[PDB]
Amino acid sequence: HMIKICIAGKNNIAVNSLQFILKNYFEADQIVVIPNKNDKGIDSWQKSLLKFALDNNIKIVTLDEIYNIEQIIFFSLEFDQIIKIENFKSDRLFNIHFSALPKYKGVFTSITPILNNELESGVTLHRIDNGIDTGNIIDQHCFPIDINDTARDLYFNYLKYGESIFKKNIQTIINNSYKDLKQTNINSSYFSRKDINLVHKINFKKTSFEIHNQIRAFIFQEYQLPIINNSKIIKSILANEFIGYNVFEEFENYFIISGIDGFKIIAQKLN
Amino acid sequence: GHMIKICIAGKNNIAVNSLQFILKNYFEADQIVVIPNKNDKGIDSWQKSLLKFALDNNIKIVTLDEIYNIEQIIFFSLEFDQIIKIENFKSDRLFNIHFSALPKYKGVFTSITPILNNELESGVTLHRIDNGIDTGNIIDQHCFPIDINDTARDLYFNYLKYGESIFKKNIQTIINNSYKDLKQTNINSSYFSRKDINLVHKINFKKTSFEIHNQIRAFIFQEYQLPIINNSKIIKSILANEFIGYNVFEEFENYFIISGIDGFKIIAQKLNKL
Ligand SMILES: Cc1cn([C@H]2C[C@H](O)[C@@H](COP(=O)(O)OP(=O)(O)O[C@H]3O[C@H](CO)[C@@H](O)[C@H](O)[C@H]3O)O2)c(=O)[nH]c1=O
Ligand SMILES: Cc1cn([C@H]2C[C@H](O)[C@@H](COP(=O)(O)OP(=O)(O)O[C@H]3O[C@H](CO)[C@@H](O)[C@H](O)[C@H]3O)O2)c(=O)[nH]c1=O
Numbered sequence: 001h002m003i004k005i006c007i008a009g010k011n012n013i014a015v016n017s018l019q020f021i022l023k024n025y026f027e028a029d030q031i032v033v034i035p036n037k038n039d040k041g042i043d044s045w046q047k048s049l050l051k052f053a054l055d056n057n058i059k060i061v062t063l064d065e066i067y068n069i070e071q072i073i074f075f076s077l078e079f080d081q082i083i084k085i086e087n088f089k090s091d092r093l094f095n096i097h098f099s100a101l102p103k104y105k106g107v108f109t110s111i112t113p114i115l116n117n118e119l120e121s122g123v124t125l126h127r128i129d130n131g132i133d134t135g136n137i138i139d140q141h142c143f144p145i146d147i148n149d150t151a152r153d154l155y156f157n158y159l160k161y162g163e164s165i166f167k168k169n170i171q172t173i174i175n176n177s178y179k180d181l182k183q184t185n186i187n188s189s190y191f192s193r194k195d196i197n198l199v200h201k202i203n204f205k206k207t208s209f210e211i212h213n214q215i216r217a218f219i220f221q222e223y224q225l226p227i228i229n230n231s232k233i234i235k236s237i238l239a240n241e242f243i244g245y246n247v248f249e250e251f252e253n254y255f256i257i258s259g260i261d262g263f264k265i266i267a268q269k270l271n
Numbered sequence: 272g273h274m275i276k277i278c279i280a281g282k283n284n285i286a287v288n289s290l291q292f293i294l295k296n297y298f299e300a301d302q303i304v305v306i307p308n309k310n311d312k313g314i315d316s317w318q319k320s321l322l323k324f325a326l327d328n329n330i331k332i333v334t335l336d337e338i339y340n341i342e343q344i345i346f347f348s349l350e351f352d353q354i355i356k357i358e359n360f361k362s363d364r365l366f367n368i369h370f371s372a373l374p375k376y377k378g379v380f381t382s383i384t385p386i387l388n389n390e391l392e393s394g395v396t397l398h399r400i401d402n403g404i405d406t407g408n409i410i411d412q413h414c415f416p417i418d419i420n421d422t423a424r425d426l427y428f429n430y431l432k433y434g435e436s437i438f439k440k441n442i443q444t445i446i447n448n449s450y451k452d453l454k455q456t457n458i459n460s461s462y463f464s465r466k467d468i469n470l471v472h473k474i475n476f477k478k479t480s481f482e483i484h485n486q487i488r489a490f491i492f493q494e495y496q497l498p499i500i501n502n503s504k505i506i507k508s509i510l511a512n513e514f515i516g517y518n519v520f521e522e523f524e525n526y527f528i529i530s531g532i533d534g535f536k537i538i539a540q541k542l543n544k545l
């Protein structure tokens with residue numbers, strides 16, 4: 001068919017990966033795009049896929065419009081819809097998921113690995129099957145969650161590494177010469193929206209590492225910041241200085257906190 | 272200096288067998304004292320009673336107050352139920368075996384917490400006691416697997432086993448005071464209190480098969496409780512690699528068949544099964 005590829009989703013990973021295909025592989029007339037339902041068609045703190053496509057004379061389609069395109073490559077890059085694979089003639093359906101699968105299937109993956117005490121995360125390119133982030137893994141890139149990284153910092157890492165893993169593998173996908181491996185049952189985890197209360201209530205009867213992690217997992221200013229006694233927190237810093245157990249002291253610009261193991265946290269208040 | 276050399280404080284097979292080992296190999300009975308836990312009524316049940324062993328072997332029962340002034344005494348907590356304040360003691364030879372791979376899973380119910388948090392292994396850790404909970408310097412650790420179908424009960428019996436073993440491995444160097452240790456790191460340190468665990472766990476099925484399995488088996492410890500699914504007590508959970516479709520739930524006379532979001536088969540065996 002004339003149309004070779006659909007890019008579906010949002011943000012700079014989608015925009016940049018589309019730019020890369022336009023520059024290196026396919027002409028506009030060979031590409032269609034499905035923006036997310038919330039795409040305003042203007043750039044914000046991320047670029048708009050809708051705007052990029054219109055600016056570049058790529059057609060905006062719906063899923064209904066591509067299901068019958070033989071051999072189309074369908075590529076989800078932060079797409080907001082669950083696919084049903086039997087809708088499609090093509091079986092060339094792919095996603096980049098922002099975690100180190102099989103762990104942290106589902107949502108809010110800039111939050112969940114932090115909240116669960118992980119030292120690393122990853123991006124994973126996989127085939128789409130009918131389950132949520134369950135299909136066979138094509139490629140994965142693991143990277144650290146540094147000790148004072150926030151959810152926002154981690155999200156910007158997913159965008160960066162996600163764009164790179166796209167570029168690394170896209171020719172094998174286009175050539176249908178990639179290899180994949182089924183995901184294991186062990187280590188598989190999943191979160192849905194119901195599992196995370198974005199207005200997090202910190203549990204201080206925890207270690208310093210855990211309290212620190214509770215704070216920084218919710219630091220993502222475009223959405224929210226965690227609040228301690230009515231002040232928003234912009235950064236948490238965990239040190240291995242021992243300051244005594246269960247410290248909590250509020251100052252004008254920051255809190256000094258330690259948990260049951262007495263390591264020092266500085267929780268910096270938003271200016 | 273003093274006649275008393277060692278105090279064993281705590282409960283269950285670990286305390287009893289450790290005490291038996293020192294009495295056989297290291298100290299006579301008049302050199303040893305014991306502090307049972309508050310709920311020890313001196314009756315052997317599914318674990319042995321430390322109080323009963325002491326009574327049966329003429330090893331004196333004491334309180335912490337009676338040992339604080341014993342210089343050089345070796346104090347060992349083997350599932351002890353009291354928090355120590357090290358400044359009460361003249362001796363600095365104060366030790367604990369905690370049932371986890373520290374620094375993870377400080378605090379309570381460590382037969383439940385690693386399972387519920389999706390771990391594949393656990394451990395026992397011999398440490399110095401400081402004024403924090405399970406925070407003192409590590410002397411030795413032995414890690415072991417949590418087998419995929421282990422229950423909390425199964426994991427508790429492995430702690431008893433490996434815990435008794437790590438005591439024997441280290442006791443000579445404690446007695447000769449030549450042991451080495453290392454400060455715990457801040458990174459990976461985790462802690463649970465009784466408030467963080469609801470022993471009447473309501474299963475979240477909007478999870479992976481692995482996670483649903485873990486949620487069930489983490490609460491299987493029949494002396495205390497069993498998890499309940501559709502008003503049936505569950506005695507065992509078995510997780511397989513077989514794909515059966517997403518979000519399966521079917522009740523049979525003797526078991527449930529369950530899968531989560533990733534569609535792996537779980538068999539949850541009912542207690543009523545003959
Ligand atoms: C909405 C929201 C998001 N965030 C943070 C954590 C999220 O990981 C990150 C990105 O948010 P979203 O893109 O809305 O949602 P997230 O669950 O990460 O993304 C999933 O759901 C998105 C919306 O359905 C899909 O477009 C993505 O493909 C899918 O991966 O921003 C917050 O901290 N607070 C928020 O309220
Ligand atoms: C009381 C209770 C226990 N358990 C299981 C899981 C526990 O890890 C295991 C042992 O129970 P306990 O010895 O009462 O509690 P546990 O938190 O494991 O032990 C801590 O607390 C004990 C009581 O303070 C201390 O004596 C120990 O040194 C300490 O390690 O039994 C249950 O599954 N349900 C229960 O209701």
Ligand SMILES: Nc1nc2c(c(=O)[nH]1)N[C@H](CN(C=O)c1ccc(C(=O)N[C@@H](CCC(=O)O)C(=O)O)cc1)CN2
Binds near residue numbers: 076081107128133
């Ligand atoms: N079938 C399928 N569709 C896929 C992917 C997948 O692996 N498989 N990857 C992406 C997965 N995805 C985003 O990357 C995506 C988008 C929307 C929702 C969604 O509708 N979420 C609800 C859950 C609804 C439900 O319970 O089924 C939520 O958590 O509240 C979920 C995931 C895009 N579509």
Ligand SMILES: Nc1nc2c(c(=O)[nH]1)N[C@H](CN(C=O)c1ccc(C(=O)N[C@@H](CCC(=O)O)C(=O)O)cc1)CN2
Binds near residue numbers: 353404
């Ligand atoms: N200071 C300290 N004491 C220790 C250990 C330790 O690492 N540090 N290890 C063990 C930790 N432990 C179990 O392994 C354990 C037991 C009870 C409580 C506790 O908090 N107990 C009582 C107060 C005790 C009393 O003074 O009578 C309570 O809260 O009711 C805390 C930890 C035994 N004691």
